[PDB]
């Protein structure tokens, strides 16, 4: 751990991208995270909510 | 648009609902219709 600096830029990029991908399993309030499943089972009105 | 259908069709015409009458026989768009009014007509039939 001599360079510090430099392997925490790069943990911390890594931890921003790792998130912002995680973000997508997220279920935000759906009824399911995954667009396609949403899509299947419900009618384009309800859907659309 | 003018037609004539029975109590239960008369739920059944509304924007994005689905059944017999409106899968096949009426469909309505998933945008705002302006108006639906429906009276029986029995003593007309």
């Not at chain 2, 009458?21 to 029995?42: E, R």
């Given at each position: 751990?001599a360079?510090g600096?430099?392997?925490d830029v790069?943990?911390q990029?890594?931890q921003?991208?790792?998130t912002?991908?995680?973000?997508?399993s997220?279920?935000?309030?759906?009824?399911?995270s995954?667009?396609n499943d949403?899509?299947?089972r419900?009618?384009?009105?309800?859907?659309?909510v | 648009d003018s037609?004539?259908?029975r109590?239960?069709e008369?739920r059944?015409?509304?924007?994005?609902?689905?059944?017999?009458?409106?899968?096949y026989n009426?469909k309505?768009?998933?945008?705002?219709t302006?108006?639906?009014?429906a009276w029986?007509?029995?003593?007309?039939?």
């Amino acid at each position: 751990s001599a360079l510090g600096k430099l392997q925490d830029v790069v943990n911390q990029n890594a931890q921003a991208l790792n998130t912002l991908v995680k973000q997508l399993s997220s279920n935000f309030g759906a009824i399911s995270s995954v667009l396609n499943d949403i899509l299947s089972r419900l009618d384009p009105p309800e859907a659309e909510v | 648009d003018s037609f004539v259908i029975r109590g239960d069709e008369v739920r059944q015409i509304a924007p994005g609902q689905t059944g017999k009458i409106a899968d096949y026989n009426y469909k309505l768009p998933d945008d705002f219709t302006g108006c639906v009014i429906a009276w029986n007509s029995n003593n007309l039939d």
